[PDB]
Design a protein around this motif. Structure first.
Motif, PDB file in Angstrom:
ATOM      1  N   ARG B  50       0.830  -1.212  -0.208  1.00 57.96           N
ATOM      2  CA  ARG B  50      -0.116   0.199  -0.045  1.00 57.96           C
ATOM      3  C   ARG B  50       0.667   1.383  -0.163  1.00 57.96           C
ATOM      4  O   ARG B  50       0.629   2.038  -0.844  1.00 57.96           O
ATOM      5  CB  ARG B  50      -1.256  -0.018   0.691  1.00 57.96           C
ATOM      6  N   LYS B  53       2.221   2.283  -2.933  1.00 56.50           N
ATOM      7  CA  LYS B  53       1.456   2.988  -3.968  1.00 56.50           C
ATOM      8  C   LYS B  53       0.979   4.535  -3.440  1.00 56.50           C
ATOM      9  O   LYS B  53       1.518   5.479  -3.961  1.00 56.50           O
ATOM     10  CB  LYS B  53       0.065   2.459  -4.504  1.00 56.50           C
ATOM     11  N   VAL B  54       0.224   4.434  -2.612  1.00 56.15           N
ATOM     12  CA  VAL B  54      -0.257   5.688  -1.931  1.00 56.15           C
ATOM     13  C   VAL B  54       0.723   6.597  -1.525  1.00 56.15           C
ATOM     14  O   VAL B  54       0.347   7.786  -1.118  1.00 56.15           O
ATOM     15  CB  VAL B  54      -1.228   5.268  -0.788  1.00 56.15           C
ATOM     16  N   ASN B  55       1.822   6.105  -1.248  1.00 56.29           N
ATOM     17  CA  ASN B  55       2.916   7.073  -0.731  1.00 56.29           C
ATOM     18  C   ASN B  55       3.147   7.954   0.510  1.00 56.29           C
ATOM     19  O   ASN B  55       3.140   8.986   0.506  1.00 56.29           O
ATOM     20  CB  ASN B  55       3.160   8.254  -1.881  1.00 56.29           C
TER      21      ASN B  55
END
Ligand SMILES: Nc1nc2[nH]cnc2c(=O)[nH]1
Ligand SMILES: Nc1nc2[nH]cnc2c(=O)[nH]1
Lengths: 338, 338
Positions: B50, B53-55
DNA sequence: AACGAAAACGTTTTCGT
DNA sequence: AACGAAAACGTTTTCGT
């Protein structure tokens, strides 16, 4: 961003990653260039990406009880030394004996994918024992049970009972026959376990401790303050006292002082833990010392093992408490008659 | 593994992830099924993926000095409450005032990509100030400077000096004119800063403190033990003492006691910090209280802000110390003449 | 000799329809 | 109305030659 590095250097990310981790030979010429870029671009390789691939986070989680608590604090500082030492990252979590709190950290942890789990929960009801199991897949060691409650963990045992016994014995061989005790929470090892160690020595000596002489504490100073009080606040009081933890002791100390009682001249006190600064207790505290650095390093170690040499079977290492004579105890009435 | 979940459920991972994070509406029928699978398969969603992606890692790092140290320990426990509260994970790092140690944790941190950095390094040489800057990109707040050393951080200020002053004043208004002081390390705020606060009040009162009366400590009990000693171990001694930290105080206490000196009847002592258990110091310690929960919660807060409401400009919130009268101080020779 | 191209790790999210 | 297919996030690593 490694892509950006590869480019500034005009080599492949593969090459980049090779140099960044010396994982295959690379021409100096090429190697410097990577660094060169690695440094103007101000590159910080992402561990999240890495871990994403290599499958390990090089990070370990402490699912503790609380961390102010001197005793605790000391162990934790220990564990962190070891993490840093062997390149691991420590995620500290206090669950305050809260179950929900506990199911919550447990989960955050698994989700952040810690390589192993160090557990210090203090009390272990079936429901916690149960959740713990749901995570047998992540390696772990409970550092605070006295015997081995489960087959799906590594356990480090403190020999808390033998410590209990040691304490009793001392008072006994010091001339004491009228002793009281402020144990800690019985649903804890360092709680129950020390009390019993102490209670065998008594039984062994034919000393009986009148129930009005045993007062439960909770390891926090205030608990000992009231305990001491209730003890000395009575018709007949003991000549000596065994206090379950140094911090409470420290509380027992202040209260005696507040009732104008002299320690050890009026009452003797023996604590337990040998916290970093019990020697500056006032009267310097005579207590049983608990190996806490070794308790920590040893715990880390069994975890690493499992983690690295992929162990499957549970294991358990014992550790040993030991008497520290300080200035809080005095000869009792029977010293000479023995 | 989410792939495995989607399959057991015969829906798309997209659907799975939608339900797992209620991020779009999904038929109950479908929704339960996902859970159903989510639960037999025993699924633990991966945060590393996660975050990948979401950083953002929803994890924060404490680059501390040490954590046993009562004072410290207390703040940390605070900060962790806040992390847990607002769903963050705390990575604790002690660098023991070691620079290398510090450049090392700094780096591990950035690499693990913490969302923000809470700094408690105690001393700040240009070289540390320098490294810190190399990370201005990750949001951060130093919780222990007294004024604002840099423009690339949030700062919480303790008003340590006004605390210093408060202390002096008290002794002064208590009849004291012969005072000594055991300050803490001058390269620290709570070190320098408190001393000076104390030194203004003196100057203000025309009290001079004879250099043989000021003895440097290091906040650890032993430091205070020797300090006290050296003080009382002299021809002419003060009637009262201002000790830079409670733990040292606690050491100053024991030593006085060891020279058969009565506190406060023979010497008065005023500490500083108001550590969780100074009240069980013996004589209950009169000290200046430092807001440590608020120091922690406040710090977390400025960080969250930056983090969440993407702040750019540095900010600084002051906090205030305050006198706690306990039982370690007594009227001095001039009380009546004022 | 010394290095590249491309798939994979486990998610989230844009557009679809 | 309610959901899928496919690209992307930043690495490591197998095979190449
Ligand atoms: N604070 C504290 N000290 C202890 N010493 C031994 N066990 C404990 C415990 O549970 N808490
Ligand atoms: N241990 C300790 N206590 C403090 N109280 C105020 N500053 C400090 C410090 O640097 N260390």
């Amino acid at each position: 961003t490694i892509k950006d590095v590869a480019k500034r250097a005009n080599v492949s990310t593969t090459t980049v990653s090779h140099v960044i981790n010396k994982t295959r030979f690379v021409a100096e010429e090429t190697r410097n260039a990577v660094w060169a870029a690695i440094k103007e671009l101000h590159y910080s390789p992402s561990a999240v990406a890495r871990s994403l691939k290599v499958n390990h986070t090089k990070s370990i989680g402490l699912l503790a009880t609380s961390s102010e608590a001197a005793y605790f604090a000391e162990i934790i500082e220990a564990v962190e030394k070891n993490c840093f030492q062997k390149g691991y990252t420590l995620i500290l979590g206090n669950a305050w004996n809260n179950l929900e709190k506990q199911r919550a950290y447990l989960s955050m942890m698994a989700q952040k994918r810690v390589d192993g789990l160090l557990v210090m929960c203090s009390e272990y009801p079936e429901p916690l024992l149960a959740m713990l199991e749901e995570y047998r897949h992540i390696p772990m060691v409970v550092m605070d049970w006295g015997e081995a409650k489960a087959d799906f963990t590594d356990a480090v045992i403190d020999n808390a009972f033998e410590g209990g016994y040691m304490a009793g014995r001392y008072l006994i061989e010091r001339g004491h026959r009228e002793i009281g005790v402020i144990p800690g929470p019985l649903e804890r090892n360092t709680g129950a376990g020390r009390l019993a160690g102490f209670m065998k020595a008594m039984e062994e000596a034919m000393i009986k401790v009148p129930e009005s002489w045993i007062v439960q504490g909770d390891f926090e100073p205030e608990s000992g303050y009231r305990a001491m009080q209730q003890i000395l606040s009575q018709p007949h009081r003991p000549t000596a006292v065994f206090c379950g933890g140094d911090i409470m002791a420290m509380g027992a100390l202040c209260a005696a002082d507040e009732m104008g009682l002299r320690v050890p001249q009026d009452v003797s006190l023996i604590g337990y833990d040998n916290v970093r600064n019990a020697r500056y207790f006032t009267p310097a505290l005579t207590t049983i010392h608990q190996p806490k650095d070794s308790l920590g390093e040893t715990a880390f170690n069994m975890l690493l093992d499992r983690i690295v040499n992929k162990r499957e079977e549970p294991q358990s290492i014992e550790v040993h408490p030991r008497l520290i004579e300080r200035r809080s105890v005095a000869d009792g009435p029977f010293r000479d008659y023995r």
